[PDB]
Each structure stands twice: as structure tokens, then as C-alpha cells.
Design a protein around this ligand. Structure first.
Ligand SMILES: Nc1ncnc2c1ncn2[C@@H]1O[C@H](COP(=O)(O)OP(=O)(O)O)[C@@H](O)[C@H]1O
Ligand SMILES: Nc1ncnc2c1ncn2[C@@H]1O[C@H](COP(=O)(O)OP(=O)(O)O)[C@@H](O)[C@H]1O
Ligand SMILES: [Zn+2]
Lengths: 313, 319
């Protein structure tokens, strides 16, 4: 398998791509890069990079101001960003898992469709800059979670007397109707997010123990949801050997370790697209630098020859 | 009054008997164990110390440059510090395997198999694994006739070594529902509780966490402190290892590192604001590996007297 995201960046079948990665690994940068890279290689289509981080990371990343309303990235023709707070814009929430996530997510699916209605321009693909916390998409399990719970009720409600059942008189069947109407919304989405050719998740990690462990946990969690996981980007690698030996033993030391774990990553995820990305000089901000960086998601970086490219950054 | 940023009062203590040292990730769990152990022993010549490990990798041996095993052995060059590396899970299998042999052809709490509920009731495996450890210790204290005044536990790299602290309350809950095996369960729930009486006393036993100043280690560390609180174990000291005070301008020729430092600092301030009440001891990143009694003790020194990146620079660069 090829050490890059070329086939995805190039894909004409995907409509929903997720980009996650806990810890300060490069989740946002990778989102933008994937987004830019895809947009640039398919001028014919339209792209939407949406975030949820209240911190307004996409704004800080590109050097522009985005909000609840889609706005093309200054300098691009088909890449638009959108930063929303789903939580900001019914209380079994603190009892049944995935109910708040399912609702919070549906809220996102609405700001998108409505933005597609006003600008009359529908997005061909949406790159999801997953929120830095919680479990954004546990809701994929809501359907099976509700089926089991509305079977506990049917087991008790059928094994009792008219008295007991007709005794409890709650304003909960206004609930009975909306839990099934939701259990339907989720499942229609699940038929989408569960199709390998339609949506995939891209993990981001640094080459260190805690991040490999954390990203391993993520892949497990994503499999349990039936979400497709086939690509992981190992960011902030510092190929210190090819580094024209800029001295510093402290770094040569770090590199030896990253290499030790790249080997594990390599042996543990042989079937995945394990993309190696260089550690740049400073922050990677603005469309220009983001583009220059994003290029190595498509054609694997060469620490020997492409060195001169990330040092002009 | 500020809580000193060091382990002086612990290393100095004459009240503690059980000290645990944990830290997931390659943060410095082993090195800190050795250091705490050495520093304690050096500060209290009058007493005897045992640094036990469970890591099958024999980390204490690789750490000191000697060979330790199931039998305590004083650290060459020390008078009151002895190490021992054992595999409690292994010895628990050899003990169980043979209990099954003596069942067919018929820790007394093994007759047949009290260990089958292991994959059912949480803490049973750990409670047994741990008692196995308390045995090799008492046994070693019986033969060499010299009992240890304090044991530093180099927690094992994985699992949940001391979840068993919950076993008592977990069995009482189960014993009420289900109300041979029943005699072994209670005989166990008594062993654990007499231990909790010990491990639950702040003046008798404490746990010291180890972490590097990065996001995942801080949260991992938080996770641990929560877990240890849930067990009623004392947690008052966190060792933030591998810090590189890059600002010292000494060899600061590197920017890449200056970058790393800015980050560590970012989290040191969180660790400092989140654990104000704790003893948050800052340890320097050395040049290379810290191995052997000599370098291990030179380093360990900064667990007692907080390190000074300006003054003490000359000390960590001789290693
Ligand atoms: N590979 C890299 N090399 C150099 N700098 C990077 C790299 N990746 C990210 N950065 C910089 O570090 C910061 C890390 O945050 P970011 O990329 O947004 O990830 P996350 O979503 O985890 O916060 C960014 O502001 C960016 O400018
Ligand atoms: N502060 C430090 N400076 C330089 N090297 C260190 C430091 N702390 C630990 N090391 C070295 O890093 C490696 C990490 O392993 P170790 O210290 O045994 O911890 P752990 O039990 O978490 O693996 C060892 O080779 C160790 O000697
Ligand atoms: Zn450096």
C-alpha cells in the first residue's frame, strides 16, 4: 500500500471525510491540508472544510475569519470553510449514550444543507475537522442502543397488569415518537458513514508512545462504529539524519525514538496508508504555506530531496 | 504556605513503609523508582530499603547495571538498598497449575481454582498477583533475617496493578446477591482489607506519579490520580521528568528544541495550576541514558533539592 493520501485526494467516490487526532499532533493542519489538496486536484468539484472547535482553529490556521456561514478561502476557487458551535445552537442526555452527540451532529447537518440552499451551490465533499474533545461520533451506535432499550420496555410493559402500566402516566410518549424519528435519522446517515466508498476517517498522530497508543484506541473505537479507517498521518517527524546534521544531539536523540515507533506503526498498520510528514520550521499558517506542506500528503515526502521545500517555511 | 516542589519530606519521612511509583508512557517510571529508592536509603542509613520490580523485562537490572532476581540483593555500592525483580503472574501460574494437579489426585486459597472467576470478577487476579508479591518479600525477610523498613514499588508498566484495593467492596456487593469457593472468597476479602488498612493510611503509604510535560501525559496522569483516589490511595507528588530548560542559553544553539521547551512550559504551568496542592517536582533532561548507581544518584539528588537550571546545569552535563 502507498504511503500517501493520493488515492483519497484523487477519489471521486467519497463525500464525507473525517480527520481526528488527540494531543497537539496536527489534526487541524492535516484537515486543512487534506481539504486544500483535494480541492486543488478536483477543480471541477466543490469542497467544504467544517470545524466545531469553539477556538475558531480554521480561522487561525488560514489567517481569515470564518463563521456560521460558508465562505470560500481567499485564494481558492472551490474550498470553503465553516466554523460552528453545534452545542451552543429532552434530557435522557445524561442517561442514554449518543443522544446528545446524535442531536449535536444533526445540528451540523442542518447548517450545511441550509448553506447549500442559500448559495444554491451544493458541496461535493465535506472534510470534517473533528472537535478536539469528547466522542463527536459515538452516535453511530445510537440506533442499536435504542433498539435494545425499547425492548426492555416491551419486555416489562408486556409482562405486567393494566394497573401498573396504566398507572405510570408520563409525558413520555411525546418521547416515544421522537426517539424513533431520531433512530431513523441516525440510521439513514449510518448507511452513508458506513460505506467505505462514501466516507472514511483519517487519523493523525505523532511518533511517540502515548500517541500510538491513543491512536490505536481511536482505530478500535472507529471500527466498533463501522467507520472506515485506512489512513493515518504521522506528523512532526524530524528526519534528523538527512537534516544536514544541524548538530544538536538532543534532536538526534528524539529522532532515534520517533524512528523506533515509526517501525512499530509500520509493522502494526502495514495494511493502512501510513503517511510520513516532516517537522517544519515554525507554525504552518496561511494558504500559501499550508499548500506547500499539504503537497506531501499526496506524494510521499523525501527528507533528502524535499528538504529544501520545508525549510523555506 | 507553599508546598515545596520536591520529595524532601517523603525521602526524609520515618513514617512511610509503602511507596509506589507509576507513570505510563516512556516518562521515567523506572529511573524515578531507583532515584526515590537511592535518595531515601542515602538519607536514612539507619534503616533498610527494598526496591521491587515486576516488569519481566528486568528493568531494575538494566537500570543499575547489575543482575537481580527473585532473591533480594543489596545494590553494589550501597549499604541499605536492595532490589528484587519477580514475575508474580508466572509464579501464580506455577502455584495454580500445581494446585490443579493436587486437586485431581487429592496462599491456601488456591485449592482447585479460585482463579477461574478472574475473567469475571474485577480485582481477583490482581489481589492474588499482589499477595504473591507480599510473600516473596516476607520470605526474603525471613531468610536474611533482616526486614526492610520501607519498600519502594516500581509499578509494572501495564494493566492495573492495584485495582484489588476495590476487591473488598466488590465482593461484599456480590456476596449479598449470591446470598468451597465461598470460604476462599472471604479468606481473601480479609487479606485485602488488612492491606487496605495499610495502603489507605497517608502516613504509611503514598503513590508518586511520573509524567513528561506533554498533553497526553498530563491527561494520562490525571486519569491515574483519579483512579488512585478511587482506591483511597494517597497521591501528593507528581514527578515531571525530561524537562529541557532550553532557555538557559547553554548550548541553546537549537531552535527545534527551543520550540519543544515553549510547549513543556505551556503544560508545566497547567500542571502547576491544576496541582497546586501537590509536590510537583521538576527534573531536567539529561544527555543520554541515566544508568548505574553513580549517575542514578547524581540525578536522584534533584528529587530532594529542587533543581536549578541556571546553577545545576554543570551537574547534569557531566552525565
Ligand atoms: N508538522 C509540523 N511542523 C511544524 N509545525 C507544525 C506541524 N504541525 C503543526 N504545526 C504547528 O503547530 C500547531 C499545532 O496545532 P494544529 O496543527 O492545529 O493541531 P491540533 O488540531 O492538534 O491543535 C499549529 O498552530 C501549527 O502551525
Ligand atoms: N531526565 C532524563 N534525562 C535523560 N535521560 C533520561 C531521563 N529520564 C529517563 N531517561 C532515560 O530514558 C529511558 C526511559 O526509560 P526509564 O527511565 O526506565 O523509564 P520507564 O520505566 O518509564 O521506561 C532510559 O534509558 C532512561 O535512562
Ligand atoms: Zn535541537
Amino acid at each position: 500500500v502507498e504511503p500517501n493520501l493520493h488515492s483519497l485526494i484523487t477519489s471521486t467516490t467519497h463525500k464525507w471525510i473525517f480527520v481526528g487526532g488527540k494531543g497537539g499532533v496536527g489534526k487541524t493542519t492535516s484537515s486543512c491540508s487534506i481539504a486544500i489538496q483535494m480541492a486543488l486536484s478536483q477543480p471541477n468539484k466543490q469542497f467544504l472544510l467544517i470545524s466545531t472547535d469553539p477556538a475558531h482553529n480554521l480561522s487561525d490556521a488560514f489567517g481569515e475569519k470564518f463563521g456560521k456561514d460558508a465562505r470560500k478561502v481567499t485564494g481558492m476557487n472551490n474550498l470553503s470553510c465553516m466554523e460552528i458551535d453545534p452545542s451552543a445552537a429532552a434530557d435522557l442526555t445524561g442517561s442514554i449514550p449518543g443522544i446528545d452527540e446524535a442531536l449535536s451532529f444533526m445540528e451540523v447537518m442542518k447548517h450545511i444543507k441550509r448553506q447549500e440552499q442559500d448559495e444554491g451551490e451544493t458541496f461535493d465533499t465535506v472534510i470534517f475537522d473533528t472537535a478536539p474533545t469528547g466522542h463527536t461520533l459515538r452516535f453511530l451506535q445510537l440506533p442499536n442502543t435504542l433498539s435494545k432499550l425499547l425492548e426492555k420496555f416491551g419486555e416489562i410493559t408486556n409482562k405486567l397488569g393494566p394497573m401498573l402500566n396504566s398507572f405510570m402516566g408520563a409525558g413520555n410518549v411525546d418521547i416515544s415518537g421522537k426517539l424513533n424519528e431520531l433512530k431513523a435519522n441516525v440510521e439513514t446517515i449510518r448507511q452513508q458513514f458506513t460505506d467505505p466508498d462514501l466516507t472514511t476517517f483519517v487519523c493523525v498522530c505523532i511518533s511517540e508512545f502515548l500517541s500510538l497508543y491513543e491512536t490505536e484506541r481511536l482505530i478500535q473505537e472507529l471500527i466498533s462504529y463501522d467507520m472506515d479507517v485506512n489512513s493515518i498521518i504521522v506528523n512532526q517527524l524530524l528526519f534528523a539524519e538527512n537534516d544536514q546534521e544541524h548538530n544538536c544531539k538532543r534532536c538526534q536523540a528524539r529522532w532515534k525514538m520517533q524512528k523506533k515507533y515509526l517501525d512499530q506503526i509500520d509493522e502494526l498498520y502495514e495494511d493502512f496508508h501510513v503517511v510520513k510528514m516532516p517537522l517544519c520550521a515554525g507554525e504552518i499558517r496561511g494558504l500559501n504555506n499550508l499548500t506547500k506542506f499539504s503537497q506531501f500528503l499526496n506524494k510521499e515526502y523525501n527528507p533528502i530531496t524535499d528538504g529544501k521545500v520545508i525549510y523555506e517555511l
